[PDB]
Amino acid sequence: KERVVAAAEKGVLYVGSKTKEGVVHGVATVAEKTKEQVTNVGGAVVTGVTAVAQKTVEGAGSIAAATGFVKKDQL
């Protein structure tokens, strides 16, 4: 009776050569969370799907993916 489903069915030179490099392809979740509670106080709470597909994050002191990150640096 009750049914839930998720389907994701699908100098440098490239001479006649296929490349995919950085790429998120298939993410099926079908999540179910009854009676969910979240109480964040000055932090970071992540309870969902995330798909980061960066290719170049060149840079000193940088951050590529800052999920659920809590940065409290001092001096």
Author numbering: 12 to 21, 36 to 100
Any passages from the paper?
Mutations and multiplications in the SNCA gene, encoding alpha-synuclein (aSyn), are associated with familial forms of Parkinson’s disease (PD). aSyn, an intrinsically disordered protein, has been a significant focus of neuroscience research not only due to its central role in PD and related synucleinopathies, but also because of its abundance and function in the nervous system. aSyn is primarily concentrated in the presynaptic terminals of neurons, but is also present in other cellular compartments including the nucleus, and is thought to interact with membranes adopting helical conformations and tetrameric structures.
Consistently, our group has recently described the novel variant G14R, that is associated with an atypical, rapidly progressive phenotype and widespread neuronal loss in combination with frontotemporal lobar degeneration-associated aSyn pathology.
